[PDB]
Design an enzyme around this catalytic site. Structure first.
Site, mmCIF file in Angstrom:
data_model
loop_
_atom_site.group_PDB
_atom_site.id
_atom_site.type_symbol
_atom_site.label_atom_id
_atom_site.label_comp_id
_atom_site.label_asym_id
_atom_site.label_seq_id
_atom_site.Cartn_x
_atom_site.Cartn_y
_atom_site.Cartn_z
ATOM 1 N N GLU A 184 -6.249 30.125 81.601
ATOM 2 C CA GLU A 184 -5.983 31.349 82.072
ATOM 3 C C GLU A 184 -7.147 32.221 81.868
ATOM 4 O O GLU A 184 -7.482 33.149 82.713
ATOM 5 C CB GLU A 184 -4.659 31.893 81.746
ATOM 6 C CG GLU A 184 -3.715 31.146 82.341
ATOM 7 C CD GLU A 184 -3.331 31.020 83.810
ATOM 8 O OE1 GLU A 184 -4.090 32.078 84.529
ATOM 9 O OE2 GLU A 184 -2.436 30.701 84.346
ATOM 10 N N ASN A 221 -5.958 39.763 92.208
ATOM 11 C CA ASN A 221 -5.207 38.748 93.137
ATOM 12 C C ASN A 221 -5.234 39.186 94.537
ATOM 13 O O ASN A 221 -5.590 40.484 94.846
ATOM 14 C CB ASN A 221 -3.886 38.505 92.821
ATOM 15 C CG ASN A 221 -3.710 38.138 91.320
ATOM 16 O OD1 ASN A 221 -2.729 38.546 90.806
ATOM 17 N ND2 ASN A 221 -4.319 36.825 91.057
ATOM 18 N N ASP A 262 -3.294 39.684 96.903
ATOM 19 C CA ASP A 262 -2.207 40.404 97.275
ATOM 20 C C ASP A 262 -2.460 41.911 96.547
ATOM 21 O O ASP A 262 -1.562 42.931 97.030
ATOM 22 C CB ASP A 262 -0.657 39.919 96.665
ATOM 23 C CG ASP A 262 -0.646 39.784 95.378
ATOM 24 O OD1 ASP A 262 -1.488 40.158 94.257
ATOM 25 O OD2 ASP A 262 0.537 39.520 95.035
ATOM 26 N N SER A 271 -2.401 42.876 93.300
ATOM 27 C CA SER A 271 -1.870 42.628 91.962
ATOM 28 C C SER A 271 -3.097 42.078 90.956
ATOM 29 O O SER A 271 -4.050 41.887 91.714
ATOM 30 C CB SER A 271 -0.746 41.716 91.617
ATOM 31 O OG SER A 271 -1.012 40.465 91.835
ATOM 32 N N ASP A 299 -4.180 40.298 87.256
ATOM 33 C CA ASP A 299 -3.714 39.323 85.988
ATOM 34 C C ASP A 299 -4.324 39.867 84.652
ATOM 35 O O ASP A 299 -5.609 40.052 84.830
ATOM 36 C CB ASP A 299 -3.777 37.962 86.099
ATOM 37 C CG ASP A 299 -3.343 37.495 87.247
ATOM 38 O OD1 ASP A 299 -2.108 37.894 87.685
ATOM 39 O OD2 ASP A 299 -3.863 36.349 87.851
ATOM 40 N N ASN A 353 1.051 38.972 85.376
ATOM 41 C CA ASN A 353 0.550 39.559 86.713
ATOM 42 C C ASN A 353 1.253 40.983 86.694
ATOM 43 O O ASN A 353 2.613 40.903 86.402
ATOM 44 C CB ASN A 353 0.852 38.411 87.623
ATOM 45 C CG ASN A 353 0.728 39.211 89.243
ATOM 46 O OD1 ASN A 353 1.521 39.624 89.942
ATOM 47 N ND2 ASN A 353 -0.548 38.963 89.832
ATOM 48 N N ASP A 384 12.282 32.715 82.875
ATOM 49 C CA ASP A 384 12.789 33.333 84.277
ATOM 50 C C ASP A 384 13.470 32.244 85.194
ATOM 51 O O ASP A 384 13.916 32.670 86.255
ATOM 52 C CB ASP A 384 11.723 34.101 84.993
ATOM 53 C CG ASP A 384 11.963 34.832 86.270
ATOM 54 O OD1 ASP A 384 12.835 35.786 86.023
ATOM 55 O OD2 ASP A 384 11.514 34.799 87.222
HETATM 56 NA NA NA Z 1 -3.536 45.499 90.479
#
Ligand code: NA
Ligand SMILES: [Cl-]
Ligand SMILES: [Cl-]
Ligand SMILES: [Cl-]
Ligand code: NA
Ligand code: NA
Length: 129
Positions: free
Chosen positions: A35, A46, A48, A50, A52, A59, A101
């Site tokens: 990572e 990302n 989208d 978002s 990380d 995220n 989760d």
């Molecule tokens: Na962001």
């Protein structure tokens, strides 16, 4: 901060991540390797929108607030910047939530693709723990 491999293993153990939700320490170290390359300051945007953050690339869509991810949540109740600290406490606490989760460590796609099923013990081999 860029951690050494055994240094990170020790810090993760200190913070109770070893065998958390049944995931041995080598799993966590392997995930961090792929990572962030053990760099607490790692960030990645990302597609989208978002981002990380940190050693485990947590995220902003679900887990932390960065003020620039529309429609997102902050389920770890932390600013995303807290995940960039030299001290891994916030990343570890949030990772505990994430791995709980429902899908375990599959939440980290890189863990699934690069660590899952492999000899993850190699990541803690030789370390004084
Ligand atoms: Na962001
Ligand atoms: Cl390494
Ligand atoms: Cl292990
Ligand atoms: Cl699981
Ligand atoms: Na968020
Ligand atoms: Na936001």
């Amino acid at each position: 901060k860029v951690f050494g491999r055994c240094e990170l293993a020790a810090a993760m153990k200190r913070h109770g991540l070893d065998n958390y939700r049944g995931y041995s320490l080598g799993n966590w170290v392997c995930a961090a390797k792929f990572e962030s390359n053990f760099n607490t300051q790692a960030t990645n945007r990302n597609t989208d929108g978002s981002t990380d953050y940190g050693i485990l690339q947590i995220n902003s869509r679900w887990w932390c607030n960065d003020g620039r991810t529309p429609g997102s949540r902050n389920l770890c109740n932390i600013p995303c910047s807290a995940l960039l600290s030299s001290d891994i406490t916030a990343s570890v606490n949030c990772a505990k939530k994430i791995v709980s989760d429902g899908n375990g460590m599959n939440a980290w796609v890189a863990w699934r693709n690069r660590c899952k099923g492999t000899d993850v013990q190699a990541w803690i081999r030789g370390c004084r723990l």
